[PDB]
From a paper:
We succeeded in crystalizing a fragment of the coiled-coil domain from each species, with different boundaries, but spanning approximately the middle one-third of this protein region (henceforth, CrSAS-6_CCMiddle, DrSAS-6_CCMiddle, and HsSAS-6_CCMiddle; see Figure S2A for the protein sequence alignment, Table 1 for a list of recombinant protein constructs, and Figure S1A for SDS-PAGE analysis of these constructs). As the HsSAS-6_CCMiddle and DrSAS-6_CCMiddle fragments did not originally include methionine residues, one or two amino acids, respectively, were mutated to methionine to allow SeMet incorporation. All three [name]-6 structures revealed two-stranded parallel coiled-coil domains as analyzed by SOCKET, in agreement with the predicted nature of this protein section. Both the HsSAS-6_CCMiddle and DrSAS-6_CCMiddle crystal structures revealed primarily antiparallel associations between their coiled coils, with only much smaller parallel associations between coiled-coil copies, which were offset by approximately one-half length or the full length of the crystallographic c-axis, respectively. A previous hypothesis posited that STIL/[name]-5/Ana2, an essential centriolar component that forms higher-order oligomers (Cottee et al., 2015; David et al., 2016; Rogala et al., 2015; Shimanovskaya et al., 2013) and binds to [name]-6 (Dzhindzhev et al., 2014; Hilbert et al., 2013; Ohta et al., 2014; Qiao et al., 2012), could cross-link [name]-6 copies, thereby stabilizing [name]-6 oligomer formation and their 3D arrangement.
The spindle assembly abnormal protein 6 ([name]-6) self-assembles into 9-fold radially symmetric ring-shaped oligomers that stack via an unknown mechanism to form the cartwheel. The characteristic shape of the [name]-6 ring led to the proposal that the protein head domains comprise the central “hub” of the centriolar cartwheel, with [name]-6 coiled coils forming the cartwheel “spokes” (Cottee et al., 2015; Kitagawa et al., 2011; van Breugel et al., 2011; van Breugel et al., 2014; Yoshiba et al., 2019).
Author numbering:
A (entry chain D): 12 to 108
B (entry chain A): 10 to 109
Write the structure that this text describes.
């Protein structure tokens, strides 16, 4: 009789107490997620920053190499100019005999 | 205490809580799933950052060696350009004596 009233009072008090717990779980999950998407956004910007830095270094390595081949060519030209001038200095010394 | 109207009221209150509990549970299941993908996404960008930091250190060392060989060459050019000037001046002074 009044027996089923008690089984139902326990069931209700249990549901309301579970509703408090589920609500705080939702509040906690939403907060744990806000920090997480702020973290993911930070690393996305960090990746993009590092990709820009890498492109910059790549272009810089290209220019350095371009300038280097130019200097190696310049050295070869000057090294030959020396050889030709030393030989001219040698032939002048040789004629004064 | 002769009326079970509290049963009819306690059953309409309970069935309403049970239906709300289904909705709250799927919200929790959906938040937990949205978070698992997000944690996986963050882990993927962490490895992408680390990969890009390795790559950056490599390019930096490479740019440093290129800059080092360039300073060496610029110095070499200056030495050779001076050797030329000194030899041309010797050739000039010999020409000058052969005139006087």
């Amino acid at each position: 009789l009044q027996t089923k009233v008690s089984e139902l009072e326990t069931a209700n008090r249990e549901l309301i107490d579970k509703k408090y717990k589920s609500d705080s779980t939702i509040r906690d999950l939403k907060a744990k997620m806000t920090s997480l998407e702020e973290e993911c956004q930070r690393s996305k910007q960090q990746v993009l920053s590092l990709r820009r830095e890498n492109s910059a270094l790549d272009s810089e390595c290209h220019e350095k190499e371009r300038l280097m081949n130019q200097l190696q060519t310049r050295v070869a030209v000057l090294e030959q100019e020396i050889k030709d001038k030393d030989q001219l200095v040698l032939r002048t010394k040789e004629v004064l005999e």
